[PDB]
Amino acid sequence: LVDLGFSLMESYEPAQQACKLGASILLETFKVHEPIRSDILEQVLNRVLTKAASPVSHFIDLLSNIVVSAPLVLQNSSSRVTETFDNLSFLPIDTVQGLLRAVQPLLKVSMSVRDSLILVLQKAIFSRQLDARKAAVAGFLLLLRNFKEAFCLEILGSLRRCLSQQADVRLMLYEGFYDVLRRNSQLASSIMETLLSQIKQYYLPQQDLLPPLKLEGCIMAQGDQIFLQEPLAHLLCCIQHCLAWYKSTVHLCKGAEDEEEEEDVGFEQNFEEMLESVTRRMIKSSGVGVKNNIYAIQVMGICEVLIEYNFKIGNFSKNKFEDVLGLFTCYNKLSEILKEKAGKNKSTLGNRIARSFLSMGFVSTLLTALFRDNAQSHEESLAVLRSSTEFMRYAVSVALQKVQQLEEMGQTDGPDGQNPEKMFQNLCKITRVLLWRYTSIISLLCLEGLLRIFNTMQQLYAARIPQFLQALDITDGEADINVTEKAAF
């Protein structure tokens, strides 16, 4: 059997059903008969930690499930690993992550795992140290193992020297600044000042400069000349959620420390100053494309990170709303190398043309407040922008596309956007608010998200058909037949 498993459930290739079966033989044989599987696990590890790129999926899922079903199966037997771990500095781009993640169960056990992991990685950083040193530095940091004389703020510095290496190291240190924050409690001033140096090199320091910022006016995040430095939008998007971070992002108020005594001054007094700057100045290597959609894309996301900054910075008041109207005027002005739009038809893809958007509850707040469902006292601006009619029924493709990917590829990218419950609750709020203004009145929008909400609410996840099937029901939501009255209704 154990031979049948290790030599079908990988190499078998229905066909996908065959491999799916072979998972059973190998896994079950690990299940029942308790003396003869320790060699099973060792067959697996080095069957799938030294090969070409196909060995991610089958064996990677199998190692995940095996170790995950391993109730401390190595929980005192970890001696193949401590010499497996060093082999990894040549694996592909995606594999090093999953290796880290899967072993992440076992890392909770004993310092003999970790006191050797830290070394066999650290050595990589001083020398060439490719993304793998980063995937690992953050993984240890963005983990409870990060908790608990605190000299590892050293390696917390080691990144900060990494911050100029390439573009890729740039995007990495960025994309996880958030999560590293969200777990991180003491380590706040460092993430702050580190960013301040990256952004102290951006923008004309004195006011009255003709462009508050330029495609080449912000210094950079990592490189900046022929390989984009931190993408100007990215350098700032980290700046944004992290900007929300000091008070209301990492720490809700940081009343004890980060926002204590109006702390903002350090991490973002220069921030908020630059904030009001990069908006107000909105008056006014890349041949055509990369120049536009990355340099001036730093303006594209300038209005991207702007929409957050202004229109969440207190946007009851009609000022910031007038400003958002301006910025979208600018963005639509940029839509000159092509045209772009919203969503109004069936959504088994997303929306018609796009890139990264704003945050992950942003489809929620924007779609369910200025898209209908929002009648009340201060309806003035919400009518003023509400009378956009080109910059609302274009500002819904953002939600239609966030959804038309965020179950076509596994985890749609925005800060706090992988943990599948917080994918879920938003995955439903978007559906209800699509309905009550596509069932209460550029017009097929909140109900051509329906091909999409359904197909990718049922096929890429089924165990919730009862949980969300009732949820569409106005104010409720037992089964396909049990909720068949709900299903029939």
Binding site: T50, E83, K123, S127, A150, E154, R161, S189, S190, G266
Partner: protein, 322 residues
């Protein structure tokens, strides 16, 4: 103490007692505030020495070394050397600390002042002299013990700046041309300085000379370096040389085992070590060159990685019948 008042008003609170000193101000704040509002002191070209002499008057009690040395952002030393107006005058007050703090009997109790006093420089981003650091450093490695040697050559990758690589490696390769307490440390520190296309084969050929007379255990380490970057078409000759050097076993249960260990870790981990480590004994002992190690390896290669049944076979058949 006028320097004491200048410091305390600068904000970073007194650090008295064995406990870590507490400086309740912004870090960028505390640095910028002190390093401006000292500049308007009366002898603005002439206060620095009168104060730093107080600093050394504060450098006496070793616990104050710890509270000087220990973490608190960085350290009062390890950030307090950020004010460029003090930025060239701090390293000189410090780096001479390592000799006279290299006398006493140091063991397993912890307070290896030669650890801390040279661990602080690593990761520095703004420090005035770019050359003088490594300059004073190299002769600073002049006559210390073997421990101080492990230290000063320990942090060479980060504390050393990224300017004089081939020159740093220049001092290196001859510091390790033939030696006794530089197989572990200086044999490792070659990874940190990502040396060029030039001095590399110099490092490599400089390897094998220590290897046939290498120490007891370091045949594990020496082995890792020999086949580490050996991969390439310029390997197989690497294998011929490696065979000729190593060539037979004397003891070492754990030693013969670990040598098999490294040989097996490489036996299926590098690219072409399979074709090579076989080929170098696979046609190349015309006369009595077959040996124990060069035979026991026949099975490791012939039953370790499953692509080599028919490979180990015809080799074993010819070199047995012939």
């Amino acid at each position: 103490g006028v320097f004491e008042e200048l410091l305390r008003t600068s904000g970073i609170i007194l650090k008295v007692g064995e406990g870590q000193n507490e400086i309740a101000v912004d870090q960028t704040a505390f640095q910028k505030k002190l390093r401006v509002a000292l500049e308007k002191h009366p002898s603005y070209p002439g206060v620095v020495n009168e104060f730093i002499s107080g600093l050394e008057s504060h450098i006496k009690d070793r616990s104050q070394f710890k509270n000087c040395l220990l973490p608190c952002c960085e350290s009062l030393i390890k950030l307090l050397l950020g004010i460029k107006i003090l930025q060239p005058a701090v390293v000189t007050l410090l780096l001479e600390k390592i000799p006279e703090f290299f006398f006493d009997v140091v063991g397993t109790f912890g307070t290896n002042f030669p650890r801390l006093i040279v661990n602080q420089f690593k990761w520095l981003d703004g420090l005035l002299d770019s050359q003088d650091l490594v300059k004073k450093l190299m002769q600073m490695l002049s006559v210390s013990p073997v421990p101080i040697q492990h230290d000063i050559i320990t942090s060479l990758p980060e504390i050393l700046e990224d300017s004089q690589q081939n020159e740093v490696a220049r001092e290196l390769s001859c510091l390790l041309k033939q030696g006794r307490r530089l197989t572990v440390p200086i044999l490792d520190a070659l990874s940190r300085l990502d040396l060029d296309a030039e001095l590399l084969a110099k490092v490599r050929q400089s390897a094998m000379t220590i290897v046939p007379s290498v120490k007891l255990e370091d045949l594990p380490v020496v082995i890792k370096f020999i086949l580490h970057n050996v991969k390439a078409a310029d390997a197989v000759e690497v294998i011929s040389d490696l065979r000729k050097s190593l060539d037979l076993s004397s003891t070492s249960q754990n030693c013969v085992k670990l040598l098999f260990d490294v040989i097996k870790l490489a036996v299926r981990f590098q690219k072409d070590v399979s074709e090579a480590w076989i080929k170098a004994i696979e046609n190349s002992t015309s006369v009595s060159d077959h040996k124990v190690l060069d035979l026991i390896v026949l099975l490791l290669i012939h039953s370790t990685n499953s692509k080599n049944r028919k490979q180990t076979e015809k080799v074993l058949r010819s070199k047995i019948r012939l």
